[PDB]
Amino acid sequence: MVNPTVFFDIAVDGEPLGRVSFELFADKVPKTAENFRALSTGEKGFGYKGSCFHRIIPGFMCQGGDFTRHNGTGGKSIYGEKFEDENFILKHTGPGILSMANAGPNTNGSQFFICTAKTEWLDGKHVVFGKVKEGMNIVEAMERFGSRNGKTSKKITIADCGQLE
């Protein structure tokens, strides 16, 4: 095997921005990687396609994944609703890190965030499970639509998403 690669085609108020591809560390966090992969392909009948990045903070991160409530309070995993923190082997070492958002210990659903900088204070609190492979320039572009409190100036949506490799 080899770690899977998924992609997100980002749009700003419908206007295509570009593609961001991610390598999912299935070799270190198989359960967390699988949740993201399946939600990216939409194979379970629900997922990221059509959802938006509701919280974008410049110099920090781009958060999304709430396909149920579309406001940062919903979303769900492919294992029911919420699942345990698999492990904290990987750290938020720098820009491009893909990690799970949560509401405290063992509350992983579908929400995730892409770091635009090293965020060591999240180590041991959020499960790191992947990283940007291609399109970091697109993530930087998305970052320009965020604000200090996270509210986005325009709607940043996942026009399409799926698996490449």
Swiss-Prot record:
Q: Which residues does the record list as Phosphoserine (modified residue)?
A: 77
What the entry lists under Pfam families is as follows: Pro_isomerase
Spell out the subcellular localization from the entry.
Cytoplasm; Secreted; Nucleus
Per the database record, which ranges form the PPIase cyclophilin-type domain? 7-163
For this protein, what is the EC number?
5.2.1.8
Which residues, renumbered to this chain, carry the PTM N-acetylvaline?
A: 2
Report the outcome of residue 125 to R.
Loss of acetylation and interaction with TARDBP
Taxonomy, superkingdom: Eukaryota
UniProt-recorded name of the protein: Peptidyl-prolyl cis-trans isomerase A
What does the organism's lineage look like at the top? Eukaryota, Metazoa, Chordata, Craniata, Vertebrata
Q: Which gene specifies this protein's sequence?
A: PPIA
